């Protein structure tokens, strides 16, 4: 308040001072089921070439 009113003497009353603001804790990402599965058995996990 002293640096808001720019004074070293503050009289009885009520003075808005600042802005209370909550912060975000963590991030969240979502997307439906994969359904993009690959047959690595053909591509990578192959026994006999």
């Amino acid at each position: 308040t002293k640096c808001t009113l720019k004074s070293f003497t503050v009289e009885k009353g009520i003075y808005q001072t600042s802005n209370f603001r909550v912060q975000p804790t963590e991030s969240i990402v979502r997307f439906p089921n994969i359904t993009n599965l690959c047959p690595f058995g053909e591509v990578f996990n192959a026994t006999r070439f």
Binding site: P39, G41, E42, A46, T47, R48, F49
Partner: protein, 116 residues
Amino acid sequence: QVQLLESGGGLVQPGRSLRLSCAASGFTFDDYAMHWVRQAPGKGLEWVSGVSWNSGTIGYADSVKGRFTISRDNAKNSLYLHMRSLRAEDTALYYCAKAVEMVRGLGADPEYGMDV
């Protein structure tokens, strides 16, 4: 329909190299195994070789292992088997067959139950 056209042999004097070709249809080439199985006229069938979805060839028969060389042309659905020193044991009807089993027949490629 299905009609597998294999050829490449004929008036072949022994001691020369060729490339027998089988063309196949009715399926997907680079995901099904085409197998060479020989059968001489008057003689029973005998397995030669194979090629799979991963081009997974395996081997050749009793006394022919090594002289043959198996290669595939996946796009135009062609199978070329190299012919070296074709004699009375090495000459036959080089049937090309397809196994019914799908991917990962288990580890081995689909090579059993080839009724077509």
